[PDB]
Amino acid sequence: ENLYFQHMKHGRVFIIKSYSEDDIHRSIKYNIWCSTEHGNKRLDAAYRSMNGKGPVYLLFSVNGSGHFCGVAEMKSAVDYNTCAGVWSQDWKGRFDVRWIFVKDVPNSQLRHIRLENNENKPVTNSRDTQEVPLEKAKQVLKIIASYK
Numbered sequence: 290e291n292l293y294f295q296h297m298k299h300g301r302v303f304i305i306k307s308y309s310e311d312d313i314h315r316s317i318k319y320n321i322w323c324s325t326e327h328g329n330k331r332l333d334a335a336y337r338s339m340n341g342k343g344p345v346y347l348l349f350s351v352n353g354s355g356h357f358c359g360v361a362e363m364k365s366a367v368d369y370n371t372c373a374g375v376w377s378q379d380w381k382g383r384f385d386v387r388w389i390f391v392k393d394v395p396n397s398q399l400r401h402i403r404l405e406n407n408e409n410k411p412v413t414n415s416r417d418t419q420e421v422p423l424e425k426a427k428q429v430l431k432i433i434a435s436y437k
């Protein structure tokens with residue numbers, strides 16, 4: 290048995306959807322990310338209200354790719370006035386992350402997990418910065434960690 294994830298009771302988990310493999314590569318290399326304006330606001334609020342009591346996890350997936358590509362933890366609030374044009378298309382600001390898992394996990398492994406906060410759609414049909422309920426997030430994390 291593996292009961293690790295089933296015992297975490299603090300933490301918030303968001304889907305990250307990127308159009309760009311370049312941005313993913315840059316994020317892994319430099320441990321930074323940037324979302325949309327409303328995406329940045331959502332993550333920032335979750336980071337600041339969490340007050341170090343638990344992690345904010347980011348489950349990354351390239352739009353159209355058919356798989357998730359890894360997991361990172363948010364590691365700073367959003368800095369909204371930073372150098373422009375560092376990403377594939379010319380985004381306002383930056384926050385620190387720490388990538389803790391880089392592995393392709395097919396959507397087939399995950400599509401049976403549905404989000405009650407998103408019309409019961411499969412977690413694999415999420416938009417950028419879709420939040421995941423913690424009990425579903427525990428299931429997703431365990432599948433990602435278990436995939437070979």
Ligand SMILES: CCc1[nH]c(=O)[nH]c(=O)c1N
Binds near residue numbers: 306307323
């Ligand atoms: C700048 C990183 C980023 N952030 C986002 O929210 N959507 C994307 O497609 C993407 N490449």
Ligand SMILES: [Cl-]
Binds near residue numbers: 389392
């Ligand atoms: Cl890894």
Ligand SMILES: [Cl-]
Binds near residue numbers: 355400413
């Ligand atoms: Cl699919």
